[PDB]
């Protein structure tokens, strides 16, 4: 083990570690011991839950979908009735995961993806139904389904995922680049022009994940959720950033509102407890 | 009965897994391989093997003509032809490199571009085959044209040339889709000189365009192609 | 590894190879990339 | 010294010399050869023609002209009708054997224009009639006369050569053992192709092995005059012709 | 690992890489370092993504059919009423697939199936019903049912599979010949006759797939979706070919529309970039 | 068939829990890891960087 | 208790398979095996003993 | 691995594996290399597809 | 590998055995392919 | 202990490493903390 506190007794000399300029920039270590007389104790401490990777390692939800067992409608395509439902994936979503994430500049893991669905019958639907849901994904530059039973859920070379409501799947994603870390931040545009967009929206193209009721239509409209969870594993990131305070507003974007609410909180006086 | 425990993902089902499973024909002896030529190992393989650009796909171009490029008489400084550098689709989105490469997200590493000249023994010219990375428009003319990288093509004796396109890029992977963030540059072909037909011959020559993969050519990502569809 | 003694049961393993693209880009004969004129 | 250009090629009792020749191809990288005694599964004794079989033949001369399509032809039937090599066919149960294939079309450095010779392994044809109706043996076994794209036939298969007979296109078709004609140089292709298949030795009559189409990429032309016409001449020879299984002559 | 690229500097020399001749049908290896001058630079990369067995075996939705659990009715077969439903295996039914395999002239590899089945009651059934599905592989020459409680169901010889709707069955399946490997295509007939049939139909005899609901009838009729996936394994494949381009008609042909849609895009000039 | 005995907590989602997973893209390369400036490994690196403290937040 | 994963084919029945399974009568012991002539070990044994054939089946 | 069939050619003799007597009982073992002159090939088999214990299990 | 004590628990082994069709097909005394009369 | 062969599949190991707050606390040019005076 190591010391937290060196026993240190009164000091009378010119070495004064208790005076410095943080004009320079630096934050110089300096311990109790240099302030005050001080008793020899251990840490008994290793750090180990203030980890990069125990911080953001464990699993957080990152998007809900609603998809659902209907009738076809032939006055509408099967993603404006939820029969299919595809999620561009973005961690920025629910916004807990976003900020823990952007604490830092650029991040590097391989992800791991919980996938859990929900059923519920809202309707006068006479028994329930363990519908079988079908996750797809579908990286950038692959075929969009257009149906609930297109051909492109025949997953030839997409990766895709089976499993029942109720039970889950999980799967590993290894770090998708292209570059050598996920950017958090962008500050710049995909190319050379006035009107192109600005951020990170720019580099998120990780591709989309589809979602499908499999089962065929029963004699009543069935409503699933899906909802997705990610956590991150081997985990690297680099240059550390301050942690926004102002409230999110979209995806991808660092805007806030026009007169937003200062998150310092105030008090009547410098001087009050 | 050793104790265990169930955790998520138990039963699902997915299409990119790896497990044994239990044989439904039980010492079964299959038939013996013999020697058959051509075996393949990896895509890559193929993907270095020249096949041709369909370049000329202009309006009204039909049947064959779509892999020839008409080069004629007294152009000179002229643009003979020019294309958008994409993988997964343009000009090249029919090429086996490109469809192969449709089934990849990403993709990294030099092309190559070929072109054979198909013009009678006794003609000649000179080309200027140039490649523009990604940061500017054009070119419009071929000032601009050389200042990218570029090839003089003199064709004579032999009848092709060859055109590495490097990796001119701050990313370590493309898309092979088309993104405007991640978009290859521009290809272009320049008449140095001009056409020279014997005297008194009027008349359009041509070459064949050709790609392929460099041997550092890499893929990343498999997905599915959006080249086929099924009612 | 093994839990079964079919080898169809067996896992997809597994072992990679080396390229040789040789087959499909240079079936020619007697010929190599010697700066030198292909067809003499 | 010796060019890459100028060639000689023996085999059997009969020679063929090129002046303008581009280097011969040995399709996949492999010669063709004898089957061995781990891949064979034929108990009976084969038979080996060699010369009496092996040798140069010659396929009937067709035009190269302004618009041709293209011609192509299937081997072995292409040969059925050649000599021994013919007789063998038929009165063997099976056989196997490699082809040397050699296309010829001469000019002069006043023309222009370029063919592409491919082979193409089990090049199951679509029919012209599309659907799903099958193209009729009498139109995959013509023999000599090979297909010309060129000619129209409502039961015959597709010929727009853009696709090359089976819906994929011809631009890609370079992936197979290939080599072009381009008057500009060569006067000539040579392509050698080994026995290959999924059976070590197979039906002479109710399959075919090979496709060998060359088609006119670029149409033929000339600096001056009125519209070009080349002969086109083809010339195969079996490599290692094995037989197996002999039986009566085969009628059909 | 291995250079991507190795430094060059300018060349002034007679060799010269950049001219050759494509009429010999070769394509001779260049690298970036013959046309310009370059930085030594690593692959970063094994290729292992692009592995035919890569390619070939991830898994695909193979086929379809449907069965129902349903009172037999004396006027129709089992099979027009689908009580049983037998499948012939071919894996060009579903086209990602079939091209996927296209590609390559002769392929070997053993198979790997995965059989799901979901149920749906469009009707007005009081209750859902795990019924069990029997699926059974009827080699050529086989007896092939006619009832759905035929005698043949008894899989004496015959290798059978039974596993419950929302469950999946999952088995291998080693590489069936007869010939040294699987012919994609087959410019050919069965026999020496004008009036044969054409192509790869003639080899295709990996016999067919029944499947039955085992389960009695119920006082409603439930209707069964079973989906068969196939995925290779110790894959192997021989002579390369270019994919096809048009839209496929029917499974076992290369047959094409009469006026098929150009694969290839156009543009208004050659010089538009 | 090794006999086995399903326990408490069987199919639970855990989402601290730590378990393999099966790859979703099988034989995947990802991209080379270049120096990049900044690494952190710990929380705790960063807690010891001075900030300013809002004091006068009357 | 150890974690583990169920795949597809978890509680199938395959009618090919071969597995353990425990006994259902526990210590039993079978009747001594005598010597019988005939011992059969392949299919093929058979296959090549001459049969009639019906070939006058007109 | 074994042979299927050993390479055999013409014969000319008084040994006669072509003629016997079925009244004997006997199904004495013959090959095509006593009916017919044969090439050398391996079975490339095990026979245990048709194993007494594959049939009946 | 084996999880029951009964013999009856295990698997199918797993062992082949050599073919001996002479049993059936030459149960005859005393006689050989010799290609000698059969009968004499 | 791994049963998945892609890096991608293994559990989220594992390594502690030590501490090096001097990226972010001491990124300046020559300097100690000796008692000395910051600016001399």
Chains 1, 5 share one sequence.
Request: proline share 6%.
């Amino acid at each position: 083990q190591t010391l937290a506190s060196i026993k240190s007794d009164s000091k009378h000399t010119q070495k004064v570690p208790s005076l410095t300029a943080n004009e320079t920039g630096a934050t110089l270590p300096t311990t109790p011991s240099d302030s005050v007389e001080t008793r020899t104790t251990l840490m008994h401490y290793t750090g180990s839950e203030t980890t990069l990777e125990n911080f953001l390692g464990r699993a957080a939800c990152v998007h809900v979908v609603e998809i659902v067992n209907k009738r076809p409608t032939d006055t509408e395509e099967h993603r404006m009735q939820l029969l299919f439902n595809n999620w561009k994936i973005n961690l920025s979503s629910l916004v807990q995961l976003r900020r823990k994430l952007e604490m830092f500049t650029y991040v590097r893991f391989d992800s791991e993806y919980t996938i859990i669905a929900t059923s519920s019958q809202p309707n006068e639907a006479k028994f329930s139904s363990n519908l079988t849901i079908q996750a797809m994904f579908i990286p950038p530059g692959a075929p969009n389904p257009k149906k609930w039973d297109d051909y492109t859920w025949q997953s030839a070379t997409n990766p895709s995922v089976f499993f029942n409501v109720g039970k889950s799947a999980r799967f590993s994603v290894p770090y998708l680049g292209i570059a050598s870390a996920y950017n958090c931040f962008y500050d710049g545009y995909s190319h050379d022009n006035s009107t192109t967009p600005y951020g990170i929206n720019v580099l998120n193209h990780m591709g989309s994940m589809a979602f499908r009721v499999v089962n065929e239509h029963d004699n009543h409209t069935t409503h699933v959720k899906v909802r997705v969870y990610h956590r991150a594993k081997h985990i690297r990131a680099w240059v550390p950033r301050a942690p926004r305070a102002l409230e999110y507003l979209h995806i991808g974007r660092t805007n806030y509102k026009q007169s937003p609410q200062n998150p310092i909180k105030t008090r009547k006086t410098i001087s009050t407890y | 009965g050793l104790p265990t425990v169930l955790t998520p993902g138990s039963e699902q089902f997915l299409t990119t897994d790896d497990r044994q499973s239990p044989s439904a024909m039980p010492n079964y002896e299959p038939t013996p391989l013999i020697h058959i030529p051509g075996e393949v190992k990896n895509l890559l393989e193929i993907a270095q093997v020249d096949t041709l650009i369909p370049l000329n796909n202009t309006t009204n171009t039909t049947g064959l003509g779509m892999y020839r490029i008409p080069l004629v008489q007294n152009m000179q400084g002229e643009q003979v032809f020019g294309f958008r550098l994409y993988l997964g689709d343009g000009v090249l989105k029919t090429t086996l490199l490109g469809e192969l490469c449709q089934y990849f997200t990403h993709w990294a590493g030099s092309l190559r571009l070929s072109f054979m000249y198909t013009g009678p023994a006794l003609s000649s010219a000179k080309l200027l085959i140039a490649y523009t990375p990604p940061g500017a428009q054009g070119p419009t003319k071929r000032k601009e044209a050389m200042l990218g990288t570029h090839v003089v093509w003199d064709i004579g004796l032999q009848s092709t040339v060859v055109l590495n396109i490097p990796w001119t890029s701050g990313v370590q992977y493309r898309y092979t889709d088309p993104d405007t963030y991640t978009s290859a540059g521009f290809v272009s072909c320049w008449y140095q000189t001009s056409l020279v037909l014997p005297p008194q011959t009027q008349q359009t020559v041509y070459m064949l365009g050709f790609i392929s993969a460099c041997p550092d050519f890499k893929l990343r990502l498999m997905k599915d192609t959006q080249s086929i569809h099924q009612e | 590894i093994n839990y079964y003694k079919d080898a169809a049961s067996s896992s997809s393993a597994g072992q990679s190879f080396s390229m040789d693209p040789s087959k499909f880009t240079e079936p020619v004969k007697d010929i190599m990339l010697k700066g030198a004129p292909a067809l003499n | 010294g010796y060019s890459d250009r100028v060639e000689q090629i023996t085999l059997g009792n009969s020679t063929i010399t090129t002046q303008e020749a581009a280097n011969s191809i040995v399709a996949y990288g492999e010669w063709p050869s004898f089957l061995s005694d781990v891949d064979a599964s034929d108990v009976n004794k084969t038979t080996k023609p060699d010369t009496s079989a092996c040798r140069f033949y010659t396929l009937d001369s067709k035009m190269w002209t302004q618009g041709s399509k293209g011609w192509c032809w299937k081997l072995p039937d292409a040969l059925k009708d050649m000599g021994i090599f013919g007789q063998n066919m038929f009165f063997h149960s099976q056989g196997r054997t490699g082809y040397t294939i050699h296309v010829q079309c001469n000019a002069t450095k006043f023309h222009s224009g370029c063919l592409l010779v491919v082979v193409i392994p089990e090049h199951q044809l679509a029919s012209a009639e599309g659907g799903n109706v099958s193209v009729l043996y009498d139109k995959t076994h013509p023999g000599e006369k090979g297909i010309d794209l060129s000619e129209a036939d409502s039961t015959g298969p597709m010929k727009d050569p853009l696709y090359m007979m089976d819906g994929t296109l011809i631009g890609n078709s370079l992936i197979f053992p290939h080599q072009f004609i381009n008057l500009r140089t060569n006067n000539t292709a040579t392509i050698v192709v080994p026995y290959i298949n999924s059976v070590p030795m197979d039906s002479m009559t109710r399959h075919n092995n090979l496709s060998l189409m060359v088609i006119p990429i670029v149409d033929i032309t000339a600096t001056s005059g009125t519209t070009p016409s080349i002969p086109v001449t083809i010339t195969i020879a079996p490599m290692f012709l094995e037989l197996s299984g002999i039986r009566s002559k085969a009628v059909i």
